[PDB]
Amino acid sequence: FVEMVDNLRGKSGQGYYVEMTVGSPPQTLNILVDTGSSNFAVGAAPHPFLHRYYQRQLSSTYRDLRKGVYVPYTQGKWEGELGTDLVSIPHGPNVTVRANIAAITESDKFFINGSNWEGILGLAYAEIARPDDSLEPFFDSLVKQTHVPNLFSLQLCGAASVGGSMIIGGIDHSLYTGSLWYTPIRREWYYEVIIVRVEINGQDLKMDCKEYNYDKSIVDSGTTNLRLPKKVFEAAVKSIKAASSTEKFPDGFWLGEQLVCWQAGTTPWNIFPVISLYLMGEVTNQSFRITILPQQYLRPVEDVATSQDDCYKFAISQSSTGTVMGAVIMEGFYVVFDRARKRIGFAVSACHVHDEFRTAAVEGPFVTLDMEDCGYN
Numbered sequence: 470f471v472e473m474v475d476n477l478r479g480k481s482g483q484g485y486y487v488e489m490t491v492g493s494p495p496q497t498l499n500i501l502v503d504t505g506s507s508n509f510a511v512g513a514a515p516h517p518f519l520h521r522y523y524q525r526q527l528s529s530t531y532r533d534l535r536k537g538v539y540v541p542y543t544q545g546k547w548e549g550e551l552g553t554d555l556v557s558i559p560h561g562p563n564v565t566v567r568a569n570i571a572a573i574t575e576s577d578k579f580f581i582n583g584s585n586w587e588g589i590l591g592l593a594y595a596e597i598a599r600p601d602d603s604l605e606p607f608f609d610s611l612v613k614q615t616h617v618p619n620l621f622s623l624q625l626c627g628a629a630s631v632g633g634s635m636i637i638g639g640i641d642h643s644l645y646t647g648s649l650w651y652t653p654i655r656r657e658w659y660y661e662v663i664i665v666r667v668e669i670n671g672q673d674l675k676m677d678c679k680e681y682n683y684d685k686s687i688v689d690s691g692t693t694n695l696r697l698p699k700k701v702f703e704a705a706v707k708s709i710k711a712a713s714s715t716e717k718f719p720d721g722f723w724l725g726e727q728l729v730c731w732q733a734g735t736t737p738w739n740i741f742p743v744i745s746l747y748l749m750g751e752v753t754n755q756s757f758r759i760t761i762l763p764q765q766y767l768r769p770v771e772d773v774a775t776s777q778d779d780c781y782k783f784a785i786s787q788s789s790t791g792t793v794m795g796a797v798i799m800e801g802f803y804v805v806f807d808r809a810r811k812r813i814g815f816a817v818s819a820c821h822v823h824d825e826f827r828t829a830a831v832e833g834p835f836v837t838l839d840m841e842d843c844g845y846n
Protein backbone atom coordinates (compact mmCIF):
# COMPACT_ATOMS: atom_id res chain seq x y z
CA PHE A 470 0.00 0.00 0.00
CA VAL A 471 3.05 2.32 -0.03
CA GLU A 472 2.24 3.10 -3.65
CA MET A 473 -1.00 4.61 -2.31
CA VAL A 474 0.49 6.65 0.57
CA ASP A 475 0.30 10.41 -0.05
CA ASN A 476 -1.86 9.86 -3.22
CA LEU A 477 -4.23 12.74 -2.30
CA ARG A 478 -3.75 16.46 -2.79
CA GLY A 479 -5.81 19.61 -2.34
CA LYS A 480 -6.36 23.07 -0.89
CA SER A 481 -8.26 24.22 2.20
CA GLY A 482 -11.99 24.38 1.56
CA GLN A 483 -11.54 22.92 -1.98
CA GLY A 484 -11.54 19.20 -1.04
CA TYR A 485 -9.13 16.31 -1.60
CA TYR A 486 -8.51 14.78 -5.01
CA VAL A 487 -6.81 11.72 -6.47
CA GLU A 488 -5.21 11.23 -9.93
CA MET A 489 -7.28 8.95 -12.15
CA THR A 490 -7.09 7.90 -15.80
CA VAL A 491 -10.05 7.43 -18.11
CA GLY A 492 -10.41 5.92 -21.61
CA SER A 493 -7.74 4.50 -23.98
CA PRO A 494 -5.16 5.82 -24.36
CA PRO A 495 -5.42 7.01 -20.72
CA GLN A 496 -6.46 10.59 -20.01
CA THR A 497 -5.16 11.82 -16.64
CA LEU A 498 -7.61 13.81 -14.46
CA ASN A 499 -7.66 14.98 -10.83
CA ILE A 500 -10.78 13.72 -9.17
CA LEU A 501 -12.33 14.90 -5.95
CA VAL A 502 -12.83 12.11 -3.40
CA ASP A 503 -16.46 12.24 -2.16
CA THR A 504 -17.89 9.73 0.33
CA GLY A 505 -21.04 11.89 0.32
CA SER A 506 -22.21 10.98 -3.19
CA SER A 507 -22.22 8.01 -5.56
CA ASN A 508 -21.59 9.26 -9.16
CA PHE A 509 -18.32 9.27 -10.99
CA ALA A 510 -18.68 12.56 -12.92
CA VAL A 511 -15.99 14.45 -14.88
CA GLY A 512 -15.72 17.71 -16.81
CA ALA A 513 -16.15 16.87 -20.51
CA ALA A 514 -16.09 20.38 -22.11
CA PRO A 515 -13.68 23.40 -21.97
CA HIS A 516 -15.12 25.24 -19.03
CA PRO A 517 -12.66 28.12 -18.36
CA PHE A 518 -11.98 27.11 -14.72
CA LEU A 519 -10.76 23.65 -15.81
CA HIS A 520 -7.10 22.62 -16.36
CA ARG A 521 -8.19 19.39 -18.06
CA TYR A 522 -11.37 17.62 -19.23
CA TYR A 523 -12.46 14.23 -20.51
CA GLN A 524 -12.28 14.05 -24.32
CA ARG A 525 -14.48 11.08 -25.24
CA GLN A 526 -13.57 11.49 -28.89
CA LEU A 527 -10.02 10.42 -28.06
CA SER A 528 -11.06 7.12 -26.47
CA SER A 529 -11.47 3.79 -28.29
CA THR A 530 -13.08 2.22 -25.25
CA TYR A 531 -15.79 4.83 -24.68
CA ARG A 532 -19.42 3.62 -24.91
CA ASP A 533 -22.45 5.89 -24.93
CA LEU A 534 -25.37 4.98 -22.68
CA ARG A 535 -27.67 7.47 -24.38
CA LYS A 536 -29.09 9.03 -21.25
CA GLY A 537 -28.43 12.32 -19.54
CA VAL A 538 -28.33 13.14 -15.80
CA TYR A 539 -29.30 16.37 -14.06
CA VAL A 540 -27.96 16.94 -10.54
CA PRO A 541 -29.31 19.96 -8.59
CA TYR A 542 -27.73 21.62 -5.54
CA THR A 543 -28.56 24.91 -3.71
CA GLN A 544 -28.35 27.49 -6.56
CA GLY A 545 -25.93 25.06 -8.25
CA LYS A 546 -25.84 21.98 -10.44
CA TRP A 547 -24.16 19.81 -13.00
CA GLU A 548 -25.60 18.05 -15.97
CA GLY A 549 -24.15 15.40 -18.24
CA GLU A 550 -24.26 12.49 -20.58
CA LEU A 551 -23.83 8.92 -19.39
CA GLY A 552 -21.36 6.42 -20.75
CA THR A 553 -18.86 3.84 -19.61
CA ASP A 554 -15.14 3.64 -20.15
CA LEU A 555 -11.95 2.06 -18.80
CA VAL A 556 -10.76 3.65 -15.55
CA SER A 557 -7.52 3.36 -13.60
CA ILE A 558 -5.91 4.89 -10.49
CA PRO A 559 -2.13 5.34 -11.06
CA HIS A 560 -1.38 5.46 -7.27
CA GLY A 561 -4.05 2.85 -6.37
CA PRO A 562 -4.54 -0.85 -7.07
CA ASN A 563 -3.08 -2.34 -10.28
CA VAL A 564 -6.33 -2.78 -12.15
CA THR A 565 -8.44 -1.27 -14.88
CA VAL A 566 -12.21 -1.32 -14.69
CA ARG A 567 -15.10 -0.41 -16.97
CA ALA A 568 -17.02 2.21 -15.02
CA ASN A 569 -19.95 4.47 -15.50
CA ILE A 570 -18.85 8.08 -16.20
CA ALA A 571 -21.10 11.16 -16.33
CA ALA A 572 -19.52 13.42 -18.97
CA ILE A 573 -20.37 16.83 -17.50
CA THR A 574 -21.51 19.11 -20.35
CA GLU A 575 -23.08 21.96 -18.31
CA SER A 576 -22.68 23.10 -14.71
CA ASP A 577 -23.43 25.89 -12.26
CA LYS A 578 -21.50 26.68 -9.05
CA PHE A 579 -19.92 23.23 -9.23
CA PHE A 580 -16.35 23.68 -10.40
CA ILE A 581 -14.13 25.98 -8.31
CA ASN A 582 -12.28 28.81 -9.97
CA GLY A 583 -8.67 28.26 -9.03
CA SER A 584 -8.88 24.56 -8.09
CA ASN A 585 -6.89 21.71 -9.62
CA TRP A 586 -9.67 19.11 -9.92
CA GLU A 587 -11.93 18.41 -12.90
CA GLY A 588 -14.29 15.74 -11.61
CA ILE A 589 -15.78 13.95 -8.63
CA LEU A 590 -15.54 10.31 -7.46
CA GLY A 591 -18.70 9.45 -5.58
CA LEU A 592 -17.74 6.63 -3.18
CA ALA A 593 -21.13 6.08 -1.39
CA TYR A 594 -23.73 3.49 -2.49
CA ALA A 595 -26.17 3.04 -5.40
CA GLU A 596 -29.26 4.20 -3.47
CA ILE A 597 -28.23 7.89 -3.83
CA ALA A 598 -26.80 7.46 -7.31
CA ARG A 599 -28.36 9.53 -10.06
CA PRO A 600 -30.53 9.28 -11.95
CA ASP A 601 -31.40 6.07 -10.15
CA ASP A 602 -29.84 3.25 -8.13
CA SER A 603 -29.39 1.09 -11.24
CA LEU A 604 -26.33 3.20 -12.18
CA GLU A 605 -23.54 1.18 -10.55
CA PRO A 606 -21.04 3.34 -8.58
CA PHE A 607 -17.36 3.17 -9.32
CA PHE A 608 -16.45 1.26 -6.21
CA ASP A 609 -19.16 -1.37 -6.77
CA SER A 610 -17.73 -1.90 -10.33
CA LEU A 611 -14.19 -1.95 -8.95
CA VAL A 612 -14.93 -4.67 -6.44
CA LYS A 613 -17.16 -6.66 -8.81
CA GLN A 614 -14.62 -6.74 -11.68
CA THR A 615 -11.39 -7.23 -9.75
CA HIS A 616 -10.01 -8.96 -6.63
CA VAL A 617 -9.76 -5.65 -4.72
CA PRO A 618 -11.23 -6.18 -1.21
CA ASN A 619 -14.49 -4.30 -0.63
CA LEU A 620 -13.03 -1.54 1.56
CA PHE A 621 -11.09 1.69 1.38
CA SER A 622 -9.62 4.01 3.99
CA LEU A 623 -8.81 7.68 4.05
CA GLN A 624 -6.21 9.67 5.91
CA LEU A 625 -7.04 13.36 5.35
CA CYS A 626 -4.27 15.65 6.68
CA GLY A 627 -4.09 19.24 5.39
CA ALA A 628 -0.47 19.89 6.48
CA ALA A 629 -2.33 26.27 1.62
CA SER A 630 -1.96 22.86 0.02
CA VAL A 631 -3.33 19.80 1.87
CA GLY A 632 -2.50 16.12 1.43
CA GLY A 633 -3.50 12.66 2.49
CA SER A 634 -3.93 9.03 1.45
CA MET A 635 -6.67 6.92 -0.02
CA ILE A 636 -5.85 3.28 0.58
CA ILE A 637 -8.02 1.28 -1.77
CA GLY A 638 -8.76 -2.31 -0.81
CA GLY A 639 -7.05 -2.20 2.56
CA ILE A 640 -5.70 -0.68 5.72
CA ASP A 641 -2.15 0.76 6.14
CA HIS A 642 -1.07 0.53 9.78
CA SER A 643 1.53 3.24 9.28
CA LEU A 644 -1.33 5.71 8.85
CA TYR A 645 -2.55 5.34 12.44
CA THR A 646 -1.76 4.86 16.12
CA GLY A 647 -3.62 2.89 18.80
CA SER A 648 -6.65 0.89 17.85
CA LEU A 649 -9.38 1.13 15.25
CA TRP A 650 -12.89 1.40 16.72
CA TYR A 651 -15.87 0.53 14.55
CA THR A 652 -19.40 2.00 14.27
CA PRO A 653 -22.03 0.17 12.15
CA ILE A 654 -23.11 1.58 8.80
CA ARG A 655 -26.82 1.88 9.64
CA ARG A 656 -27.90 1.84 6.00
CA GLU A 657 -26.03 1.59 2.73
CA TRP A 658 -26.96 4.81 0.92
CA TYR A 659 -24.84 7.56 2.46
CA TYR A 660 -22.17 6.28 4.90
CA GLU A 661 -24.78 6.59 7.62
CA VAL A 662 -23.86 6.29 11.33
CA ILE A 663 -25.48 6.96 14.75
CA ILE A 664 -24.19 9.51 17.22
CA VAL A 665 -25.33 8.49 20.68
CA ARG A 666 -23.81 11.22 22.79
CA VAL A 667 -21.99 14.52 22.50
CA GLU A 668 -19.77 16.16 25.05
CA ILE A 669 -18.36 19.64 24.66
CA ASN A 670 -15.22 19.49 26.82
CA GLY A 671 -16.31 16.47 28.86
CA GLN A 672 -19.71 17.88 29.75
CA ASP A 673 -22.67 16.58 27.82
CA LEU A 674 -25.50 18.28 25.88
CA LYS A 675 -28.14 16.18 27.66
CA MET A 676 -30.48 16.18 24.66
CA ASP A 677 -32.51 13.40 23.18
CA CYS A 678 -29.76 11.57 21.27
CA LYS A 679 -32.35 11.01 18.44
CA GLU A 680 -31.90 14.65 17.55
CA TYR A 681 -28.12 14.20 17.01
CA ASN A 682 -29.19 12.05 14.09
CA TYR A 683 -32.21 14.06 12.73
CA ASP A 684 -32.68 12.97 10.08
CA LYS A 685 -29.14 11.70 9.26
CA SER A 686 -25.62 11.49 10.44
CA ILE A 687 -23.09 10.66 7.71
CA VAL A 688 -19.36 10.56 7.11
CA ASP A 689 -18.46 12.77 4.15
CA SER A 690 -15.06 13.66 2.74
CA GLY A 691 -16.73 16.12 0.31
CA THR A 692 -17.89 18.47 3.12
CA THR A 693 -15.44 20.75 4.94
CA ASN A 694 -17.39 21.29 8.12
CA LEU A 695 -18.87 19.47 11.01
CA ARG A 696 -22.51 20.17 10.32
CA LEU A 697 -25.19 19.63 13.05
CA PRO A 698 -28.98 19.52 12.75
CA LYS A 699 -30.48 22.95 13.58
CA LYS A 700 -31.76 22.02 17.06
CA VAL A 701 -28.52 20.23 18.04
CA PHE A 702 -26.41 22.99 16.43
CA GLU A 703 -28.38 25.55 18.42
CA ALA A 704 -27.51 23.68 21.67
CA ALA A 705 -24.10 22.71 20.31
CA VAL A 706 -23.19 26.40 19.76
CA LYS A 707 -24.93 27.43 23.03
CA SER A 708 -22.43 25.27 24.95
CA ILE A 709 -19.41 26.24 22.81
CA LYS A 710 -20.22 29.91 23.40
CA ALA A 711 -20.32 29.39 27.21
CA ALA A 712 -17.29 27.08 27.13
CA SER A 713 -15.47 30.07 25.64
CA SER A 714 -16.98 33.24 27.23
CA THR A 715 -13.34 34.21 28.05
CA GLU A 716 -13.25 36.38 24.87
CA LYS A 717 -16.27 37.82 23.03
CA PHE A 718 -17.11 37.18 19.34
CA PRO A 719 -20.08 38.32 17.18
CA ASP A 720 -23.36 36.41 16.61
CA GLY A 721 -22.75 36.25 12.82
CA PHE A 722 -19.47 34.42 13.39
CA TRP A 723 -21.26 31.42 14.95
CA LEU A 724 -23.58 31.40 11.91
CA GLY A 725 -20.54 31.42 9.54
CA GLU A 726 -21.52 34.93 8.34
CA GLN A 727 -18.30 36.59 9.48
CA LEU A 728 -14.69 35.48 9.76
CA VAL A 729 -12.90 35.72 13.10
CA CYS A 730 -9.33 37.02 13.22
CA TRP A 731 -6.35 37.16 15.52
CA GLN A 732 -2.79 38.24 14.61
CA ALA A 733 -0.03 35.80 13.58
CA GLY A 734 0.49 33.08 16.23
CA THR A 735 -1.94 34.87 18.57
CA THR A 736 -4.31 32.14 19.76
CA PRO A 737 -3.06 29.96 22.67
CA TRP A 738 -4.58 26.50 22.41
CA ASN A 739 -7.21 26.80 25.23
CA ILE A 740 -10.21 29.22 25.02
CA PHE A 741 -12.22 26.53 23.14
CA PRO A 742 -13.61 23.20 24.34
CA VAL A 743 -12.95 19.80 22.83
CA ILE A 744 -15.82 18.03 21.15
CA SER A 745 -16.37 14.32 21.66
CA LEU A 746 -18.85 12.38 19.63
CA TYR A 747 -19.81 9.00 20.98
CA LEU A 748 -20.69 6.68 18.17
CA MET A 749 -22.68 3.47 18.33
CA GLY A 750 -20.31 0.50 18.78
CA GLU A 751 -20.28 -2.96 17.29
CA VAL A 752 -21.84 -4.59 20.38
CA THR A 753 -25.19 -4.02 22.11
CA ASN A 754 -24.97 -1.31 24.77
CA GLN A 755 -21.28 -0.53 23.82
CA SER A 756 -20.15 2.77 22.29
CA PHE A 757 -16.81 4.51 21.74
CA ARG A 758 -15.92 8.18 21.37
CA ILE A 759 -13.83 10.26 19.06
CA THR A 760 -12.40 13.54 20.29
CA ILE A 761 -11.31 16.54 18.20
CA LEU A 762 -9.70 19.89 18.91
CA PRO A 763 -10.62 23.46 17.84
CA GLN A 764 -7.51 23.24 15.60
CA GLN A 765 -9.95 21.26 13.44
CA TYR A 766 -13.27 23.10 13.87
CA LEU A 767 -11.34 26.42 13.67
CA ARG A 768 -10.03 26.39 10.07
CA PRO A 769 -7.81 29.12 8.53
CA VAL A 770 -9.40 30.69 5.45
CA GLU A 771 -6.68 30.12 2.79
CA ASP A 772 -6.32 33.69 1.53
CA VAL A 773 -8.33 36.78 2.49
CA ALA A 774 -7.28 39.77 0.33
CA THR A 775 -8.52 42.39 2.85
CA SER A 776 -6.37 41.15 5.80
CA GLN A 777 -2.91 39.92 6.92
CA ASP A 778 -3.95 37.97 10.08
CA ASP A 779 -4.73 34.39 11.17
CA CYS A 780 -8.40 34.67 10.12
CA TYR A 781 -10.05 31.36 10.97
CA LYS A 782 -13.56 30.31 10.00
CA PHE A 783 -15.87 28.40 12.38
CA ALA A 784 -16.40 24.96 10.90
CA ILE A 785 -19.68 24.08 12.65
CA SER A 786 -22.99 24.75 10.98
CA GLN A 787 -26.54 23.68 10.64
CA SER A 788 -28.61 21.46 8.39
CA SER A 789 -32.03 20.29 7.52
CA THR A 790 -30.55 17.07 6.10
CA GLY A 791 -28.62 16.10 9.28
CA THR A 792 -25.20 15.75 10.92
CA VAL A 793 -22.26 15.66 8.54
CA MET A 794 -18.91 14.52 9.67
CA GLY A 795 -16.68 16.26 7.13
CA ALA A 796 -13.00 17.08 6.95
CA VAL A 797 -13.15 18.90 10.28
CA ILE A 798 -13.87 15.47 11.84
CA MET A 799 -11.98 13.19 9.43
CA GLU A 800 -8.72 15.18 9.59
CA GLY A 801 -8.27 14.02 13.21
CA PHE A 802 -8.49 10.38 12.21
CA TYR A 803 -7.74 7.46 9.97
CA VAL A 804 -11.11 6.33 8.69
CA VAL A 805 -11.84 2.88 7.36
CA PHE A 806 -14.85 2.47 5.11
CA ASP A 807 -15.26 -1.26 5.76
CA ARG A 808 -17.91 -1.93 3.19
CA ALA A 809 -17.56 -5.73 3.39
CA ARG A 810 -18.62 -5.67 7.11
CA LYS A 811 -20.95 -2.63 6.98
CA ARG A 812 -18.88 -0.59 9.38
CA ILE A 813 -16.71 2.46 9.64
CA GLY A 814 -13.50 2.34 11.64
CA PHE A 815 -11.92 5.28 13.40
CA ALA A 816 -8.35 5.55 14.77
CA VAL A 817 -6.05 8.43 15.71
CA SER A 818 -4.34 9.58 12.52
CA ALA A 819 -0.56 9.45 12.30
CA CYS A 820 -0.78 12.88 10.62
CA HIS A 821 -3.19 14.87 12.78
CA VAL A 822 -1.97 18.24 14.15
CA HIS A 823 -1.26 17.96 17.89
CA ASP A 824 1.24 19.34 20.43
CA GLU A 825 1.77 18.48 24.16
CA PHE A 826 -1.45 19.93 25.62
CA ARG A 827 -4.65 18.31 24.26
CA THR A 828 -4.75 15.58 21.56
CA ALA A 829 -7.35 13.95 19.24
CA ALA A 830 -8.45 10.58 20.65
CA VAL A 831 -10.48 7.46 19.94
CA GLU A 832 -11.50 5.70 23.15
CA GLY A 833 -13.78 2.92 24.42
CA PRO A 834 -15.62 0.91 25.45
CA PHE A 835 -18.32 3.04 27.01
CA VAL A 836 -21.68 1.82 28.26
CA THR A 837 -24.58 3.47 26.46
CA LEU A 838 -28.16 2.13 26.58
CA ASP A 839 -30.92 2.64 24.00
CA MET A 840 -28.47 3.44 21.24
CA GLU A 841 -31.12 2.36 18.66
CA ASP A 842 -33.58 5.02 19.88
CA CYS A 843 -30.92 7.44 18.65
CA GLY A 844 -31.72 6.51 15.00
CA TYR A 845 -34.56 8.27 13.10
CA ASN A 846 -37.19 6.37 11.08
Ligand SMILES: Nc1cccc(CCc2ccc3cc[nH]c3c2)n1
Binds near residue numbers: 505506579690
Ligand atom coordinates in the same frame (compact mmCIF):
# COMPACT_ATOMS: atom_id res chain seq x y z
N1 LIG B 1 -20.61 15.37 -0.37
C1 LIG B 1 -20.98 16.40 -1.09
C2 LIG B 1 -21.83 17.37 -0.58
C3 LIG B 1 -22.20 18.45 -1.36
C4 LIG B 1 -21.75 18.54 -2.66
C5 LIG B 1 -20.91 17.56 -3.18
C6 LIG B 1 -20.39 17.64 -4.59
C7 LIG B 1 -18.88 17.56 -4.65
C8 LIG B 1 -18.18 18.73 -4.01
C9 LIG B 1 -18.33 20.01 -4.55
C10 LIG B 1 -17.68 21.10 -3.99
C11 LIG B 1 -16.86 20.91 -2.88
C12 LIG B 1 -16.07 21.77 -2.09
C13 LIG B 1 -15.46 20.99 -1.10
N2 LIG B 1 -15.84 19.71 -1.28
C14 LIG B 1 -16.70 19.63 -2.35
C15 LIG B 1 -17.35 18.54 -2.91
N3 LIG B 1 -20.55 16.50 -2.39
